[PDB]
Amino acid sequence: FNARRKLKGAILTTMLATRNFS
Amino acid sequence: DQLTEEQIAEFKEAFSLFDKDGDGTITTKELGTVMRSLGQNPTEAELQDMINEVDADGNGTIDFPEFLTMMARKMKDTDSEEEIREAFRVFDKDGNGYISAAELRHVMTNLGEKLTDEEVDEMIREADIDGDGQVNYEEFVQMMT
Ligand SMILES: [Ca+2]
Ligand SMILES: [Ca+2]
Ligand SMILES: [Ca+2]
Ligand SMILES: [Ca+2]
Ligand SMILES: [Zn+2]
Ligand SMILES: [Zn+2]
Ligand SMILES: [Zn+2]
Ligand SMILES: [Zn+2]
Ligand SMILES: [Zn+2]
């Protein structure tokens, strides 16, 4: 289990969602 | 500087969080799901513009190459320190300035990821530099920089 990839991927997804997919 | 290999992997995990049916593409429906679950409330109209702006071929959906091109630009974002703070606030549900494991479990569950309590505690440990058992702003910024 890559805990760092899972977390950073999720936070990147959250960054995208808060800036209207940009 | 360049797009390193691990960064690509991180981007791949981001992509898969959107690409809910795992069919290689992000639709407006999939994008809508995710944003709704992260507390954003866009309209069908807005969603369609969001796809279009990074659909640089024009077939109505987004594949990983298109996603990657955006993610590449976002790597040199001037508004980056602020974009990270905003994401932090999505995770930090009580506004107390630390992300607990419960808070992280909530977001992860909302994104449609099914995790064990150990898998969650492992992600917290990844970022928890000061050993308090939860991720604060500075640690969050550190990890994402
Ligand atoms: Ca899909
Ligand atoms: Ca396309
Ligand atoms: Ca909190
Ligand atoms: Ca900590
Ligand atoms: Zn836009
Ligand atoms: Zn930006
Ligand atoms: Zn500010
Ligand atoms: Zn636990
Ligand atoms: Zn383990």
Numbering used by the authors:
A (entry chain B): 1 to 22
B (entry chain A): 2 to 146
Passage from the reporting paper:
CaM is a major Ca2+ sensor that regulates several target proteins involved in cardiac muscle contraction, including RyR2, Cav1.2, and CaMKIIδ. CaM is a Ca2+ sensing protein able to bind up to four Ca2+ ions through its Ca2+-binding EF-hand motifs: two located in its N-domain (EF-1 and EF-2) and two in its C-domain (EF-3 and EF-4). The associated structural transition to an open conformation upon Ca2+ binding mediates interaction with CaM’s targets and signal transduction. At high [Ca2+], Ca2+/CaM binding to CaMKII releases the regulatory domain from the catalytic domain.
Ca2+/CaM and the E140G mutant were cocrystallized with CaMKIIδ294-315 to gain molecular insight into the interaction. The structural superimposition Ca2+/CaM-WT-CaMKIIδ294-315 with Ca2+/CaM-E140G-CaMKIIδ294-315 showed rather low RMSD of 0.949 Å with difference mainly at the N-terminal region of CaM. Using ITC, we showed that Ca2+-CaM can interact with CaMKIIδ294-315, with a stoichiometry of 1.
